[PDB]
Design a protein around this ligand. Structure first.
Ligand SMILES: *[C@@H]1O[C@H](CO)[C@@H](O[C@@H]2O[C@H](CO)[C@@H](O)[C@H](O)[C@H]2NC(C)=O)[C@H](O)[C@H]1NC(C)=O
Ligand SMILES: *[C@@H]1O[C@H](CO)[C@@H](O[C@@H]2O[C@H](CO)[C@@H](O)[C@H](O)[C@H]2NC(C)=O)[C@H](O)[C@H]1NC(C)=O
Ligand code: NAG
Ligand code: NAG
Ligand code: NAG
Ligand code: NAG
Lengths: 172, 322, 321, 172, 321, 170
């Protein structure tokens, strides 16, 4: 959508992931398996939970209609009562409906932004050390073990350590 | 030339769609429905308190004591009141209930009455207390009349002037009802009361009423072409009400103690009872829900989801899967 | 070196839009959604012509003021037009009782059939004509509301009146009547014999007693007497029962409500258009397809939605250089 | 703008572009011109129409403003009736305007994001075979003839095809 | 090697904003837009002092309840202040008719000017100074409303009153009057002689007829007797016409309506503060350039807009570490 | 943070910078310190302000409540008049509260984007001439004195010059 990640450079999602909303999938010699981003699947569930809770609270004080009766010589005021209560019911229906439409869109793009930002989080961590295929993936110039792939996620990453078999592997 | 890491997102088997400004029907991973669309088409206690279901009586017919409402002559604390669109039992005898909607509105603010006897039918020494009844108000076939008010008649061809007071020596407010009878001609006026020129005065610290029958020729209604006009007052504790009349007086006998003020409601519903229980009620049925919204009906009583005019209202909680 | 560039559209447009953050942003494409235009004329509504009261009020019309003869029998209308201040309203000063509550009843009504419920002719112990006042001139000659009779003693005697009319018709039925308020005992004596007087009217719903207020008031249209008029709707198969011994202003004609439905009463000085429209406004009609309009708040028929702004333009295109 | 493409890194728009909302400009020997992006323009006239339709849909219910008349001793209720209708016209006038004002800013940012997803798309396709001018432009490190230009615009661009030739100019 | 970093501001701010997705985002700069502050005094409004009714109700003031005499000849006011339940309302119990309507007329009036219209001494065949009661004591001594006169029979007779007054001023004119209901036929005779009485008031507009209601009522202010006051607005060059043969509470002083404009009756227990203000609310005045306030829904003057919220700050700068 | 500049790719802000909202921190041959992008910040101060004024200006027309009184047999319309004044009060409170929330987010992301749209503007000028440290910084492959640095800020950094100095490390 707006941040070109979900269904952007990345054309689809992964049926195979189920531990969380966003994450990484690794395909190395020492194994293969999926893994979820605890630190960023959490940030988003929290944010989206505030959305849902702030929308309900914002609405919990809308008009509350009340029955009122009038006699056949108060038809003017009965019609005034009527057009009033409908009018508010409409003002609050328009409110609810559109608040939902608006925040739905923002919620999607919020997921877009979250995915792209994750890609950049890693992309900056490796630089030249890995190649950008262009469809959501990083092709390691070297060989990364399972304690190294979980280091790109761990938060920091041994580039000075790994820089060595990277230039070496680059020339050819 | 492998050893590659990838970044990606969740997907599942979900058809749950939401709408947005620029797009409609967008299947997403997870969503949260927020609209209650569903009700049990039955009226219920709220909560552990049964409504007052007037059946086929109106509020007028109930407070005056229309003979076909004897069913409600003694009645417990209620949560809300249920009246049909058109109760067939209102006033057996034709006429008017003065300030009726203002009184109806007081009711919605009241949870419990306590009928008491303020002027015993047996306290009318020099007037005829038990002879006023109509084939318009019938109980068990036999002619009868409103049970809470008394249609006094001349006793042995004389109607002396009445002077009755009543002192609210209770702690609570009193709803007092009384009426005036409009007859059809001098002849009939002569029959029921001797006196041809008649009035009714009612006093209270607040009330200052004077009423004179309009002896006149009216279209028959329920068989009766005369008319009764009723009137009411809240008599405060320690206040006192004085009646004075030389005829056409429809005296109080039973008046109601307002023993409990709360949040109530008169609602119009054709739907009937269900021995169930709820914490939110609607004219067309009740609501057990956790939603924040609903589209059942604009009128509710009790803790309720707020009302909306929508068929569909869902929050996108996940991302746009495929 | 060979080159490829990504870029965007720009054109000859000067259409503007605004933002919460920047005003008058020139954009390449826009959609104006606000209609700001109307003909300056009142027109038919879905091929149904309005009732245009000219200088009559509705009381003027339904009572039958002698200047209101244009509207003695009226065809089906869509809506009604009044001036803010019709000069022909009540030709004789007094009150129309529940007047606004009636006007409103009248705005759900598209047609009346006028009928004679009690012929003038049939007053035989009383004098039905004269009857008239210089406050109510017709062709410069003293007259009185047509739909109603100002009854007067005959042969120095006013026998108690007792009439009935029972509604034997399909439809509901608007009935008007009234009471004369004299200015002193003499005038009361000259017109009806009897010094103490009443009028009582009765239906299943109604049950009224009117007693003349014989006092002196200041002059209005030259008269300082008064007439208080009253109405009701007599249902099918009820009957209206009249009884009076003076000061009784009697119905002659009544109105059958024959077509109910959406109507309206609007104040406007604007001439008839001789056109048709689906949307109408006190200041002229609206033929649009826009979503919004800012013409007037009071509109009649299927219309754009009103809004108070002068500018409502939606951006459909990107920033322009 | 807000994704820094329209009137951001890409200084201005092309008068010369008329077959769409966003497009390419190329220049090589055969020569140069404009070819508007097919799919990403359609994606915009599809998803902006909907926006303009969503606003007319969420607005068909409004306040039925009716005239009511009151007499000289009903000044209180009349004034309440006037205040009620003023109030309702005011609320809906706000609603209509703010909605427009917020979706205009949204729309603008939507075009601005559609361009930065086009540019980004080419950038990931081209990799190092081309120089980023930072103008919204790429100068090729090889020879791109038209079947090559339609290759960039297609999303069919073969990287290894011109890969060897590319690296020579990068060095010299 | 040499380095260059891009970054952003962070100060010592403690200010919080809110968003749909997060509460309490501490932020670098934030503008507060909600006023939560009032000097809890009632003030002048743009240089005009309000009318502090103290313990008098509107009714006790215009009728002139003896205990209210501080309001005899009141200067221009900007708005009017009543307590919730004033003690001095109607000293002699009864009703004030179309009360709530009249008050509404005052929210549009800034100044009256009392003018004697029927002077007390002009009553020559009736008893002018005998109409006093302990229900309205003045300085201990039994007294009465100072703007109206309670007429008593003279020499055991009550000849039919006929008095007219014509409005020869430029201004609309507020006139009040009353009727007294007796307790029994005895009292009726003692006060007024005539067993059956009436009051009729007329104008171009008004056509009223009051008749006493005799009855037994509980004592209020040690009186079972009741008094219903009535009012009308007499336009210039029109005339009021009074007739009565008993129970009449005649007018003496009446109110020239000399200044119209925005005003208001507010109910407030708060005392004056000898201060000025552009904006005034029942719990206190507001001096604030904020767009919005928190204080009270009812305000008068040039004021911010009311909102129920307890926090309204707009984010101005960035998220803060 | 929606655009990721704040505070994802830059962990924290700068207690040290005062001259504006967004700027640069540089350590070089003559030392280190802060300078500010006087004109970038200014576009935001321009925009944020107009936004405030507009938000205020949508409210200058609102609902104004009025003291209306009713007697003891007018409890229905007194009730009606209360539910209608509360009715509008709730509506405008909803509107102001919600708008302030909605735009508070747009204003926070606004600053986020602004920053990113600066880091992009520097990355585009330097290119092969420095490392992307990845924390908001750049390690220069060459040596950079002030006209050189003050030039990346000017918006004009004549890249063709320093190209050889960088070729040497790789
Ligand atoms: C009804 O009766 C009560 C007492 O039976 C009256 O009570 C008056 O005032 C106080 C109230 O606590 C009593 O202590 C007094 O003794 C009572 N006054 C008198 C004169 O008896 C009450 O006023 C009566 N109702 C009316 C209308 O008088
Ligand atoms: C009130 O008094 C005034 C004057 O005392 C009367 O006005 C006169 O009316 C006639 C026209 O009807 C003319 O002679 C003048 O136009 C009026 N007077 C003045 C001074 O211009 C008025 O008629 C009286 N109104 C009533 C109802 O008595
Ligand atoms: C949304 O889906 C339904 C099928 O349930 C269909 O009726 C509707 O037309 C769709 N909406 C649009 C805008 O096409
Ligand atoms: C009205 O007339 C019809 C027959 O003429 C009948 O249904 C009904 O009995 C009459 N009612 C009255 C009130 O006269
Ligand atoms: C926007 O344009 C109008 C139309 O001429 C102009 O009058 C107004 O001042 C402009 N607003 C601003 C902020 O420039
Ligand atoms: C925001 O912070 C304040 C503490 O001053 C507190 O009153 C409020 O409950 C907090 N809200 C949330 C959602 O944490």
């Amino acid at each position: 959508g707006l941040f070109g990640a979900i269904a952007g450079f990345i054309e689809g999602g992964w049926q195979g992931m189920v531990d969380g909303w966003y994450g990484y999938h690794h395909s190395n010699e020492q194994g293969s398996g999926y893994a979820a981003d605890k630190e960023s699947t959490q940030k988003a569930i929290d944010g989206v939970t505030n959305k849902v809770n702030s929308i309900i609270d914002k609405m919990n004080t809308q008009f509350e209609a009340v029955g009122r009766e009038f006699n056949n010589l108060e038809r003017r005021i009965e019609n005034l009562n009527k057009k009033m209560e409908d009018g508010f019911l409409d003002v609050w229906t328009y409110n609810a409906e559109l608040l939902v439409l608006m925040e739905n869109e923002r919620t999607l793009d919020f997921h877009d932004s979250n995915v792209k930002n994750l890609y950049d989080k890693v992309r900056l961590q490796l630089r030249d050390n890995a190649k950008e295929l262009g469809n959501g993936c990083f092709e390691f110039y070297h060989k990364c073990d399972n304690e190294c792939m979980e280091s790109v996620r761990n938060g920091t990453y041994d580039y000075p350590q790994y820089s060595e078999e990277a230039r070496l592997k680059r020339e050819e | 030339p492998g050893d590659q890491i990838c970044i990606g997102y969740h997907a599942n088997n979900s058809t749950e769609q939401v709408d947005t400004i620029m797009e409609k029907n967008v299947t997403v991973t997870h969503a949260q429905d927020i609209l209650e669309k569903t009700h049990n088409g039955k009226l219920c206690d709220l909560d552990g308190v049964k409504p007052l279901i007037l059946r086929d009586c109106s509020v007028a017919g109930w407070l005056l004591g229309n003979p076909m409402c004897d069913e409600f002559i003694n009645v417990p604390e209620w949560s809300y009141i249920v009246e049909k669109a058109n109760p067939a039992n209102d006033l057996c005898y034709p006429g008017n209930f003065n300030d009726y909607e203002e009184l109806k509105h007081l009711l919605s603010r009241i949870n419990h009455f306590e009928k008491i006897q303020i002027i015993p039918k047996s306290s009318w020494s020099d007037h005829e207390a038990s002879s006023g009844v109509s084939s318009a108000c019938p109980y068990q076939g036999t002619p009868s009349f409103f049970r809470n008010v008394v249609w006094l008649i001349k006793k042995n061809n004389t109607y002396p002037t009445i002077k009755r007071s009543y002192n609210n020596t209770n702690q609570e407010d009193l709803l007092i009802l009384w009426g005036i009878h409009h007859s059809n001609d001098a002849a009939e006026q002569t029959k029921l009361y001797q006196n041809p020129t008649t009035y009714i005065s009612v006093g209270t610290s607040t009330l200052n009423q004077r009423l004179v029958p309009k002896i006149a020729t009216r279209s028959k209604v329920n068989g009766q072409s005369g008319r009764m006009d009723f009137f009411w007052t809240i008599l405060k504790p320690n206040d006192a009400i004085n009646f004075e009349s030389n005829g056409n007086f429809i005296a109080p006998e039973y008046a109601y103690k307002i023993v409990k003020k709360g949040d109530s409601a008169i609602i119009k519903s054709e739907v009937e009872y269900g021995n169930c229980n709820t914490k939110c009620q609607t004219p067309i049925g009740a609501i057990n829900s956790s939603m924040p919204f609903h589209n059942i009906h604009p009128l509710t009583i009790g803790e309720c989801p707020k009302y909306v005019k929508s068929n569909k209202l869902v929050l996108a909680t996940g991302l746009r899967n495929s």
